[PDB]
Amino acid sequence: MIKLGIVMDPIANINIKKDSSFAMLLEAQRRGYELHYMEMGDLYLINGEARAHTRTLNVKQNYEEWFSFVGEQDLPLADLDVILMRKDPPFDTEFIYATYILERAEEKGTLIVNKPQSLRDCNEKLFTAWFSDLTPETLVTRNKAQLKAFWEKHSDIILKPLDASIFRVKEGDPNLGVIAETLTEHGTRYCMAQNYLPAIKDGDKRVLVVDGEPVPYCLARGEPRPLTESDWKIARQIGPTLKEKGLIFVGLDIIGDRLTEINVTSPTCIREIEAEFPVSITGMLMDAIEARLQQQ
Amino acid sequence: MIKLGIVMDPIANINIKKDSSFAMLLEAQRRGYELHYMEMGDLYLINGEARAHTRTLNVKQNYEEWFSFVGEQDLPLADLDVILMRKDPPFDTEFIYATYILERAEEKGTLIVNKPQSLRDCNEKLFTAWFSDLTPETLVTRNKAQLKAFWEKHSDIILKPLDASIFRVKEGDPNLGVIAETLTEHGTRYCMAQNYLPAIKDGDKRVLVVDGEPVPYCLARGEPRPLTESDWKIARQIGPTLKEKGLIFVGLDIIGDRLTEINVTSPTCIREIEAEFPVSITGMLMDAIEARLQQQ
Amino acid sequence: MIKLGIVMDPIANINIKKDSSFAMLLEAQRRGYELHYMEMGDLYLINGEARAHTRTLNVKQNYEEWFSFVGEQDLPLADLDVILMRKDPPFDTEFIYATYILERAEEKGTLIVNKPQSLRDCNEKLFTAWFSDLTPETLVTRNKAQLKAFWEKHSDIILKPLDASIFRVKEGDPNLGVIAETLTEHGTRYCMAQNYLPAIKDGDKRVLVVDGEPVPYCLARGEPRPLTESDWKIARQIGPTLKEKGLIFVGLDIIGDRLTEINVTSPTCIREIEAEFPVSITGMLMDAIEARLQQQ
Amino acid sequence: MIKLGIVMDPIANINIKKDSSFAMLLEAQRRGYELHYMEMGDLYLINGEARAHTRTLNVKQNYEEWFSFVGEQDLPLADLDVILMRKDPPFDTEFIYATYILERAEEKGTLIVNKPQSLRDCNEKLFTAWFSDLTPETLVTRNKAQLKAFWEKHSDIILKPLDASIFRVKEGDPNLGVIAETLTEHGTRYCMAQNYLPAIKDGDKRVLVVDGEPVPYCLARGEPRPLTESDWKIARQIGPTLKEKGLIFVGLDIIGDRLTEINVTSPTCIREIEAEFPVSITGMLMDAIEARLQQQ
């Protein structure tokens, strides 16, 4: 069978009613995969070989007991067929170090969803710089004077840290200086400004893309909808780049007809769309994984 | 002429007697390049285009006044032929974000020394996992129990943070637990252990590699020496990988016949080797840059 | 009845088999006090008046359910007769701010165990500077050069942060510099050095003092013992100062015949001594509280 | 003569045109005091005795060279007659530890301006809780829900951290939640809210009080003015408490007829008032110090 590993934040603390990682584990188990649970602290590197302490895992939709460990072992990660990296943000240096550990197992034949080097290349907020055609006006800077000028030009902007804490600075806001100071840590940290998009009142849509192919229903933040014509247009333009970079399960954040963020670490909204619509997103994912496992 | 940009820690605070970045700027100026000075805070990104505020720079070996700005401008980074990224460690998330800014200029034709994606791929302590043949016994972990066992097996080890603060834990040291606790931040951060190498008493050599080719004299930490036979062997084995990854100016740290670290951000020791030996390392670098600029 | 309030770290996470705060709540309940539970976040200040959101609490030695809330209210803290400040270390600025909130209730007649201003005056590591006669050789400094010289003079020393992480630097340790660097954060933070006391092998005794009077049995760290002659001597010398400073429940840490630390925030070891010996430490505490409540 | 010590942030970085500490050193030198310079890192504690490395200092109004050291020594702080604690905020735990070091010298007869225990008792933002009659509506809390309700009741409020970064949240501001989240660090840190005072447009006055006596001219933030009738009223009400707490040189911040903050660490504005008006504030301070030195 396929031996599936998952690296994630502690399973004992999720909400199985909405957790997408758990929805993935149930599908994988329904297909008969052997599942191996691990957290960040379980991964290590010894003389260049990637290894982990895993626990063989069993999961079930039981609100009183949704997982159990039926075994425990130390193995080279190269023994697993596929590892799902499902660690939540922040994207910090520890996340980047775990990426090098997963890449040593990847050189030995393991499929990593998503690809380690692409996780380092494709920042969730800065990767939109590669698709400026699709995005709002975006400025990334440490300088208060540039943030002041962007606010003068656009009148109503969003200020966000790169690593929610979104400030909206409308015309007549008294705090642009304090906010710039706070997010740039007095000019020592980069932050991002975008023009505010009023279409947010119509929904912050979450579109999922499975191996480059958009799932046909999205979740407008919480109401499931079919993709509109402009949703299909954004997703078809990014899709090919996600497939070739090995970004196999991606979330795109779309407000109106603007692409605002690209989630490549732990995209969610599977349960919410699946409940209202006849699509098995977890099934599409595992079909795509299995396809990749036979392509090599 | 070539327009050379440099991103570095503030020039007003260096020691021009030993600073290698300054030694590079003097050579570039001696060849007639137009030099453009910038710090991290000068770089920004607007709708996917990389730009910076630069200052045209003039440098001279004058201990009372070694640089002056003769102009100031805002330009797209794609207007510069080559940018030297010479920012010091730490390798943190800000360093990683600046890397994406330099890579947007790189897609537009600018040569970046060293290549942005390789700066993200090649951690200075963890890239040695790709050359385990050349390195000491190395363990990377968050677990105190694994560090305890490595210390039992090797009797005398080095503990270092990934991001100097090197602890030597010899036989009979009472602090392995406190030290593991301190470097792993009670098991939440990865750290690195290696077996101690007694050949350190003979020197921590600094070998420089310019576009894959080892400079023939190194600095044993501070005494300049010709490369020994095993120094040539280590450097010839890494060299090709550095060239193809676009890691054009690299420092390797060698203790005895063991490779311990790979400096790809801001390697130094140019002045120290150049003073005692008939080699112009800065000249080798600029010849290599100019070669790369005509190869495309 | 007496209305007793307690400020503490979350009750849902303690171990009722050894927690001394819980042992205090059971005694108070056995005497019929009305108990009011609060955490740090429940305390606030409005126009100089101290107030809190409390929960009326019920406790019982049940490992499956040891507490329940039977009510909830917002009141001025001046309505409670006595508040036990049982927040764990660190002693940080938040701890210091909560102290000013408790002191506004104290001006209005509430007894605070221990007294707020004394919690600010009496640091657990630095208050020993007032009893140098009883302590080991102690140096507090940010300077590596002074720590090096103390180590030269004493050969075997203890290095500790002021805010466990105790380093022992014996003769021949290779790390004094790295350790000084780490605890002083490269000379920006004070740390403490003391000469090592070999009598630690015979026990790190925990003596409790209730309103200036030593409890006659201590816990040598884990074995309960009667106080020795030198334990009685140390405790009788500190005792009067603790009583007049309103430090009503204190822990003293004694190694051999040396006083090393003074716990004034959350002293423990009640359950361990009480189990093996015929003393009710919680009863001595509540008798002392009740005495203080009738003395005014 | 009097031997005056000063603990301050590095003298090599001040602006002698406006620095009040420097204005104090010039007056002290004009009276013939022997001046001893020290920074935080110079202070230490050995077996309960407070000591420091001092440098004998000479100062002069020379923009190219305003100070020189004419000697260097290690002494017990009890040898100095008076130490001026002139360390800038933040009020952090290091500031609190230095306070215990200065208090050990104070027990041995040294006058400390301002008194160490009062520096711990009198927080610059929270000490206003003792004079609620004079202050605006003030709430101190970690709870977003209480900050939301204060904003509903007052329509236009100020949010500030306890340890500038003042947020004004007017009617219709979209960010109260993000700001509360940012200043309380998601409910783990206390912050302060006050109702906004429109009289700020007429000036944020800085009144100085020397040993309980108000200096008769203030600086409205930058225009020097005589104290108004309500300025005299606020200062006469606080004054006696400052004198008896040994808070010898204090700054009060007054907006309109409201007391907003009490500066007890490093009050300034001496040069600005002294230039426009016939008062020697430094002379009033040294007369008060000399009076205190003969009162014991």
Side-chain angles (χ1 to χ4, degrees):
Chain A
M1 70 299 236
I2 298 172
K3 294 171 204 161
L4 178 310
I6 184 167
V7 182
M8 63 184 279
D9 295 275
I11 196 161
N13 296 139
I14 63 175
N15 182 349
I16 63 172
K17 271 178 287 69
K18 50 182 64 71
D19 196 78
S20 293
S21 295
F22 192 76
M24 294 179 190
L25 296 176
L26 290 170
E27 180 52 22
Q29 184 171 276
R30 192 192 67 82
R31 296 186 174 211
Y33 296 3
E34 181 177 85
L35 314 173
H36 283 262
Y37 179 73
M38 62 208 130
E39 293 170 17
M40 295 284 277
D42 287 323
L43 309 167
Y44 64 99
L45 207 55
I46 176 66
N47 297 323
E49 176 181 51
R51 297 203 161 236
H53 164 244
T54 74
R55 267 107 101 199
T56 311
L57 178 79
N58 201 98
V59 295
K60 45 174 140 53
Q61 198 78 15
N62 183 133
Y63 297 95
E64 274 54 83
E65 200 191 56
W66 52 95
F67 70 98
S68 52
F69 298 129
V70 298
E72 190 177 357
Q73 52 277 129
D74 185 275
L75 41 69
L77 290 189
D79 278 9
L80 302 183
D81 297 313
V82 59
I83 300 158
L84 303 169
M85 176 49 153
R86 288 288 299 171
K87 180 65 186 76
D88 284 326
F91 186 63
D92 62 2
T93 44
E94 293 303 301
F95 197 107
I96 287 147
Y97 300 141
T99 259
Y100 302 131
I101 293 175
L102 295 172
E103 198 178 7
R104 295 252 80 216
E106 187 192 49
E107 288 172 359
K108 292 274 182 285
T110 310
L111 179 68
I112 315 295
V113 177
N114 291 144
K115 187 179 173 67
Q117 187 191 46
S118 301
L119 291 179
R120 290 186 305 262
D121 294 344
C122 306
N123 182 249
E124 295 183 339
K125 291 197 183 66
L126 260 46
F127 199 35
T128 65
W130 282 259
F131 299 102
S132 58
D133 286 4
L134 305 182
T135 66
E137 297 294 292
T138 304
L139 168 63
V140 183
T141 186
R142 294 186 170 179
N143 299 313
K144 188 180 194 308
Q146 298 189 268
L147 290 174
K148 220 293 245 179
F150 191 80
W151 177 51
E152 290 184 319
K153 173 186 173 169
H154 288 291
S155 302
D156 187 356
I157 61 172
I158 293 303
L159 265 287
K160 59 242 274 280
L162 301 179
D163 76 320
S165 36
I166 288 165
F167 286 83
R168 186 174 167 199
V169 188
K170 296 190 302 205
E171 198 155 27
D173 196 282
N175 305 311
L176 192 277
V178 211
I179 294 165
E181 222 85 72
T182 296
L183 298 189
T184 67
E185 274 183 50
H186 178 262
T188 59
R189 269 154 200 100
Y190 293 105
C191 70
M192 180 193 260
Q194 299 179 307
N195 56 303
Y196 169 76
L197 296 164
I200 180 63
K201 313 295 73 159
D202 302 296
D204 188 337
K205 294 166 287 180
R206 299 287 151 92
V207 180
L208 272 355
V209 194
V210 180
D211 207 17
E213 193 61 32
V215 174
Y217 302 105
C218 73
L219 182 80
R221 289 275 181 192
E223 181 191 58
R225 307 185 172 160
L227 301 198
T228 68
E229 199 180 349
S230 48
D231 289 332
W232 281 110
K233 172 217 189 296
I234 289 177
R236 286 302 191 191
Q237 212 168 311
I238 307 174
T241 302
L242 301 180
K243 184 174 173 63
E244 68 182 280
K245 277 191 143 293
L247 295 167
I248 298 178
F249 181 63
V250 169
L252 305 178
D253 288 12
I254 300 173
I255 290 176
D257 72 328
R258 266 39 231 131
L259 170 73
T260 60
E261 256 170 60
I262 284 171
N263 193 324
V264 292
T265 54
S266 243
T268 194
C269 297
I270 283 188
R271 290 288 223 222
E272 287 82 352
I273 301 168
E274 284 191 345
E276 236 276 307
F277 279 116
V279 61
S280 174
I281 300 167
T282 56
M284 285 178 75
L285 218 207
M286 305 305 148
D287 290 339
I289 282 175
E290 288 174 2
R292 303 291 270 208
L293 298 181
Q294 276 63 96
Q295 287 190 329
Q296 191 54 74
Chain B
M1 70 299 236
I2 298 172
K3 294 171 204 161
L4 178 310
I6 184 167
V7 182
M8 63 184 279
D9 295 275
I11 196 162
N13 296 139
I14 63 175
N15 182 349
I16 63 172
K17 271 178 287 69
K18 50 182 64 71
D19 196 78
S20 293
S21 295
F22 192 76
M24 294 179 190
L25 296 176
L26 290 170
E27 180 52 22
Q29 184 171 276
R30 192 192 67 82
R31 296 186 174 211
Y33 296 3
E34 181 177 85
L35 314 173
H36 283 262
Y37 179 73
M38 62 208 130
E39 293 170 17
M40 295 284 277
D42 287 323
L43 309 167
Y44 64 99
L45 207 55
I46 176 66
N47 297 323
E49 176 181 51
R51 297 203 161 236
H53 164 244
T54 74
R55 267 107 101 199
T56 311
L57 178 79
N58 201 98
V59 295
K60 45 174 140 53
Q61 198 78 15
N62 183 133
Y63 297 95
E64 274 54 83
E65 200 191 56
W66 52 95
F67 70 98
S68 52
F69 298 129
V70 298
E72 190 177 357
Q73 52 277 129
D74 185 275
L75 41 69
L77 290 189
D79 278 9
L80 302 183
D81 297 313
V82 59
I83 300 158
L84 303 169
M85 176 49 153
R86 288 288 299 171
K87 180 65 186 76
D88 284 326
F91 186 63
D92 62 2
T93 44
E94 293 303 301
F95 197 107
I96 287 147
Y97 300 141
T99 259
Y100 302 131
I101 293 175
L102 295 172
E103 198 178 7
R104 295 252 80 216
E106 187 192 49
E107 288 172 359
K108 292 274 182 285
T110 310
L111 179 68
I112 315 295
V113 177
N114 291 144
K115 187 179 173 67
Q117 187 191 46
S118 301
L119 291 179
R120 290 186 305 262
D121 294 344
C122 306
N123 182 249
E124 295 183 339
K125 291 197 183 66
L126 260 46
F127 199 35
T128 65
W130 282 259
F131 299 102
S132 58
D133 286 4
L134 305 182
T135 66
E137 297 294 292
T138 304
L139 168 63
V140 183
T141 186
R142 294 186 170 179
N143 299 313
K144 188 180 194 308
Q146 298 189 268
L147 290 174
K148 220 293 245 179
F150 191 80
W151 177 51
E152 290 185 319
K153 173 186 173 169
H154 288 291
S155 302
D156 187 356
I157 61 172
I158 293 303
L159 265 287
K160 59 242 274 280
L162 301 179
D163 76 320
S165 36
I166 288 165
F167 286 83
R168 186 174 167 199
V169 188
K170 296 190 302 205
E171 198 155 27
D173 196 282
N175 305 311
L176 192 277
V178 211
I179 294 165
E181 222 85 72
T182 296
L183 298 189
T184 67
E185 274 183 50
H186 178 262
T188 59
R189 269 154 200 100
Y190 293 105
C191 70
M192 180 193 260
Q194 299 179 307
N195 56 303
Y196 169 76
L197 296 164
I200 180 63
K201 313 295 73 159
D202 302 296
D204 188 337
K205 294 166 287 180
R206 299 287 151 92
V207 180
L208 272 355
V209 194
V210 180
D211 207 17
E213 193 61 32
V215 174
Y217 302 105
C218 73
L219 182 80
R221 289 275 181 192
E223 181 191 58
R225 307 185 172 160
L227 301 198
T228 68
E229 199 180 349
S230 48
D231 289 332
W232 281 110
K233 172 217 189 296
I234 289 177
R236 286 302 191 191
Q237 212 168 311
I238 307 174
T241 302
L242 301 180
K243 184 174 173 63
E244 68 182 280
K245 277 191 143 293
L247 295 167
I248 298 178
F249 181 63
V250 169
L252 305 178
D253 288 12
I254 300 173
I255 290 176
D257 72 328
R258 266 39 231 131
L259 170 73
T260 60
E261 256 170 60
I262 284 171
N263 193 324
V264 292
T265 54
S266 243
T268 194
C269 297
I270 283 188
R271 290 288 223 222
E272 287 82 352
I273 301 168
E274 284 191 345
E276 236 276 307
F277 279 116
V279 61
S280 174
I281 300 167
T282 56
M284 285 178 75
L285 218 207
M286 305 305 148
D287 290 339
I289 282 175
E290 288 174 2
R292 303 291 270 208
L293 298 181
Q294 276 63 96
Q295 287 190 329
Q296 191 54 74
Chain C
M1 70 299 236
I2 298 172
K3 294 171 204 161
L4 178 310
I6 184 167
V7 182
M8 63 184 279
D9 295 275
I11 196 161
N13 296 139
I14 63 175
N15 182 349
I16 63 172
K17 271 178 287 69
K18 50 182 64 71
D19 196 78
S20 293
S21 295
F22 192 76
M24 294 179 190
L25 296 176
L26 290 170
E27 180 52 22
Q29 184 171 276
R30 192 192 67 82
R31 296 186 174 211
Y33 296 3
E34 181 177 85
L35 314 173
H36 283 262
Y37 179 73
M38 62 208 130
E39 293 170 17
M40 295 284 277
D42 287 323
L43 309 167
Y44 64 99
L45 207 55
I46 176 66
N47 297 323
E49 176 181 51
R51 297 203 161 236
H53 164 244
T54 74
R55 267 107 101 199
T56 311
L57 178 79
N58 201 98
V59 295
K60 45 174 140 53
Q61 198 78 15
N62 183 133
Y63 297 95
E64 274 54 83
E65 200 191 56
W66 52 95
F67 70 98
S68 52
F69 298 129
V70 298
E72 190 177 357
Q73 52 277 129
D74 185 275
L75 41 69
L77 290 189
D79 278 9
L80 302 183
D81 297 313
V82 59
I83 300 158
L84 303 169
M85 176 49 153
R86 288 288 299 171
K87 180 65 186 76
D88 284 326
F91 186 63
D92 62 2
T93 44
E94 293 303 301
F95 197 107
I96 287 147
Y97 300 141
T99 259
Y100 302 131
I101 293 175
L102 295 172
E103 198 178 7
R104 295 252 80 216
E106 187 192 49
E107 288 172 359
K108 292 274 182 285
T110 310
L111 179 68
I112 315 295
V113 177
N114 291 144
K115 187 179 173 67
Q117 187 191 46
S118 301
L119 291 179
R120 290 186 305 262
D121 294 344
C122 306
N123 182 249
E124 295 183 339
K125 291 197 183 66
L126 260 46
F127 199 35
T128 65
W130 282 259
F131 299 102
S132 58
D133 286 4
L134 305 182
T135 66
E137 297 294 292
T138 304
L139 168 63
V140 183
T141 186
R142 294 186 170 179
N143 299 313
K144 188 180 194 308
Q146 298 189 268
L147 290 174
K148 220 293 245 179
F150 191 80
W151 177 51
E152 290 185 319
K153 173 186 173 169
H154 288 291
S155 302
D156 187 356
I157 61 172
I158 293 303
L159 265 287
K160 59 242 274 280
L162 301 179
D163 76 320
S165 36
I166 288 165
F167 286 83
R168 186 174 167 199
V169 188
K170 296 190 302 205
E171 198 155 27
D173 196 282
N175 305 311
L176 192 277
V178 211
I179 294 165
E181 222 85 72
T182 296
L183 298 189
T184 67
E185 274 183 50
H186 178 262
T188 59
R189 269 154 200 100
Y190 293 105
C191 70
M192 180 193 260
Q194 299 179 307
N195 56 303
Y196 169 76
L197 296 164
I200 180 63
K201 313 295 73 159
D202 302 296
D204 188 337
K205 294 166 287 180
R206 299 287 151 92
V207 180
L208 272 355
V209 194
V210 180
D211 207 17
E213 193 61 32
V215 174
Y217 302 105
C218 73
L219 182 80
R221 289 275 181 192
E223 181 191 58
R225 307 185 172 160
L227 301 198
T228 68
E229 199 180 349
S230 48
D231 289 332
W232 281 110
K233 172 217 189 296
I234 289 177
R236 286 302 191 191
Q237 212 168 311
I238 307 174
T241 302
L242 301 180
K243 184 175 173 63
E244 68 182 280
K245 277 191 143 293
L247 295 167
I248 298 178
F249 181 63
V250 169
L252 305 178
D253 288 12
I254 300 173
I255 290 176
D257 72 328
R258 266 39 231 131
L259 170 73
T260 60
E261 256 170 60
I262 284 171
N263 193 324
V264 292
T265 54
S266 243
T268 194
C269 297
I270 283 188
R271 290 288 223 222
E272 287 82 352
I273 301 168
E274 284 191 345
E276 236 276 307
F277 279 116
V279 61
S280 174
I281 300 167
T282 56
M284 285 178 75
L285 218 207
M286 305 305 148
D287 290 339
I289 282 175
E290 288 174 2
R292 303 291 270 208
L293 298 181
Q294 276 63 96
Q295 287 190 329
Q296 191 54 74
Chain D
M1 70 299 236
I2 298 172
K3 294 171 204 161
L4 178 310
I6 184 167
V7 182
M8 63 184 279
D9 295 275
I11 196 161
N13 296 139
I14 63 175
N15 182 349
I16 63 172
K17 271 178 287 69
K18 50 182 64 71
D19 196 78
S20 293
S21 295
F22 192 76
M24 294 179 190
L25 296 176
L26 290 170
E27 180 52 22
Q29 184 171 276
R30 192 192 67 82
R31 296 186 174 211
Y33 296 3
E34 181 177 85
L35 314 173
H36 283 262
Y37 179 73
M38 62 208 130
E39 293 170 17
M40 295 284 277
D42 287 323
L43 309 167
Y44 64 99
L45 207 55
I46 176 66
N47 297 323
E49 176 181 51
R51 297 203 161 236
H53 164 244
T54 74
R55 267 107 101 199
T56 311
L57 178 79
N58 201 98
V59 295
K60 45 174 140 53
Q61 198 78 15
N62 183 133
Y63 297 95
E64 274 54 83
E65 200 191 56
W66 52 95
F67 70 98
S68 52
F69 298 129
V70 298
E72 190 177 357
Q73 52 277 129
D74 185 275
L75 41 69
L77 290 189
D79 278 9
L80 302 183
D81 297 313
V82 59
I83 300 158
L84 303 169
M85 176 49 153
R86 288 288 299 171
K87 180 65 186 76
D88 284 326
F91 186 63
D92 62 2
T93 44
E94 293 303 301
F95 197 107
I96 287 147
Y97 300 141
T99 259
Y100 302 131
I101 293 175
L102 295 172
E103 198 178 7
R104 295 252 80 216
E106 187 192 49
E107 288 172 359
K108 292 274 182 285
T110 310
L111 179 68
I112 315 295
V113 177
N114 291 144
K115 187 179 173 67
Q117 187 191 46
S118 301
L119 291 179
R120 290 186 305 262
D121 294 344
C122 306
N123 182 249
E124 295 183 339
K125 291 197 183 66
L126 260 46
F127 199 35
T128 65
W130 282 259
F131 299 102
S132 58
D133 286 4
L134 305 182
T135 66
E137 297 294 292
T138 304
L139 168 63
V140 183
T141 186
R142 294 186 170 179
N143 299 313
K144 188 180 194 308
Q146 298 189 268
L147 290 174
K148 220 293 245 179
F150 191 80
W151 177 51
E152 290 184 319
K153 173 186 173 169
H154 288 291
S155 302
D156 187 356
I157 61 172
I158 293 303
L159 265 287
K160 59 242 274 280
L162 301 179
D163 76 320
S165 36
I166 288 165
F167 286 83
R168 186 174 167 199
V169 188
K170 296 190 302 205
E171 198 155 27
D173 196 282
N175 305 311
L176 192 277
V178 211
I179 294 165
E181 222 85 72
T182 296
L183 298 189
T184 67
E185 274 183 50
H186 178 262
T188 59
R189 269 154 200 100
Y190 293 105
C191 70
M192 180 193 260
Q194 299 179 307
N195 56 303
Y196 169 76
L197 296 164
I200 180 63
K201 313 295 73 159
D202 302 296
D204 188 337
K205 294 166 287 180
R206 299 287 151 92
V207 180
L208 272 355
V209 194
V210 180
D211 207 17
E213 193 61 32
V215 174
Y217 302 105
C218 73
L219 182 80
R221 289 275 181 192
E223 181 191 58
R225 307 185 172 160
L227 301 198
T228 68
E229 199 180 349
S230 48
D231 289 332
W232 281 110
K233 172 217 189 296
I234 289 177
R236 286 302 191 191
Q237 212 168 311
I238 307 174
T241 302
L242 301 180
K243 184 174 173 63
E244 68 182 280
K245 277 191 143 293
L247 295 167
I248 298 178
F249 181 63
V250 169
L252 305 178
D253 288 12
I254 300 173
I255 290 176
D257 72 328
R258 266 39 231 131
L259 170 73
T260 60
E261 256 170 60
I262 284 171
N263 193 324
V264 292
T265 54
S266 243
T268 194
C269 297
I270 283 188
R271 290 288 223 222
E272 287 82 352
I273 301 168
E274 284 191 345
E276 236 276 307
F277 279 116
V279 61
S280 174
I281 300 167
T282 56
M284 285 178 75
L285 218 207
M286 305 305 148
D287 290 339
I289 282 175
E290 288 174 2
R292 303 291 270 208
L293 298 181
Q294 276 63 96
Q295 287 190 329
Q296 191 54 74

